[PDB]
Amino acid sequence: AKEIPEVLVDPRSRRRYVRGRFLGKGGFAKCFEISDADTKEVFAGKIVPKSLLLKPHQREKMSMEISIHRSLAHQHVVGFHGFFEDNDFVFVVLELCRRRSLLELHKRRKALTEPEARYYLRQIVLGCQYLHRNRVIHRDLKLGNLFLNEDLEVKIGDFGLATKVEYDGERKKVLCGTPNYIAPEVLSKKGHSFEVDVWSIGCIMYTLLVGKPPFETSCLKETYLRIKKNEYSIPKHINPVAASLIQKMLQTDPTARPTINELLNDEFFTSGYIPARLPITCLTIPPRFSIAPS
Ligand SMILES: COc1cc(C(=O)NC2CCN(C)CC2)ccc1Nc1ncc2c(n1)N(C1CCCC1)CC(F)(F)C(=O)N2C
Ligand SMILES: [Zn+2]
22 and 81 share one domain: yes
The ligand with the least distance to the CA atom of 173 is 2
- What is the maximal distance between C-alpha atoms in the chain? 62
Alpha-carbon span 18 to 37, nearest angstrom = 6
The CB density around residue 2, as the number of other CB atoms within 10 Å, is 8
Residue 262 sits at φ, ψ, to 5 deg, of: -90, -25
Q: Are strands 146-148 and 154-156 parallel, antiparallel or unpaired?
A: antiparallel
Same domain flag for 267 and 225: yes
Q: From atom 34 of ligand 1, which residue's Cα is the shortest distance away? A: 46
Using the mean position of ligand 1's atoms as its centre, give its distance from the Cα of residue 92 in Å. Answer: 13
Edge to edge, what strands does the sheet with 30-36 contain? Answer: 7-10, 15-24, 30-36, 42-49, 89-94, 80-85
**How far apart, in Å, do the first and last CA atoms of the chain sit?**
60
Binding-site annotation: residue ranges for ATP: 23-31, 46, 95, 142-145, 158
Q: Is 95 helix (H, G, I), strand (E, B) or coil?
A: coil
133 and 160 within one domain: yes
Of 56, 82, 100, the last residue of a domain is 100
Angle at 26 between CA 175 and CA 91, to 5 degrees: 95
140 part of the active site: yes
Residue ranges lining ligand 1, Cβ < 6 Å:
23-24, 26, 31, 33, 44, 46, 78, 94, 96-98, 100, 147, 157-158
CA 279 to chain centre: 22
Ligand 2 mean position, distance from CA 138 (Å): 16
Residue 236 domain-assigned (yes or no): yes
| 3-state percent helix, strand, coil for the chain, nearest multiple of 5 | 35, 20, 45
Ligand nearest to the CA of 69: 1
- At CA 136, angle to CA 153 and CA 206, rounded to 5? 50
In this structure, the answer to whether residues 67 and 82 fall within a common structural domain is yes
Q: Domains in the chain: how many in total?
A: 2
Distance CA(288)–CA(64), nearest Å, equals 43
Pick the atom of ligand 1 nearest to 44's CA.
35
Q: Distance between CA atoms of 131 and 91, rounded to whole angstroms? A: 24
If asked whether residues 107 and 244 sit together in one domain, one would say: yes
Ligand 1 atom 7 nearest Cα: 23
What is the residue range of 237's domain? 101-273
Resolution in A: 2.6
Q: Clarify whether residues 116 and 95 are in a common domain.
A: no
Q: How many CB atoms lie within 10 A of CB 276?
A: 5
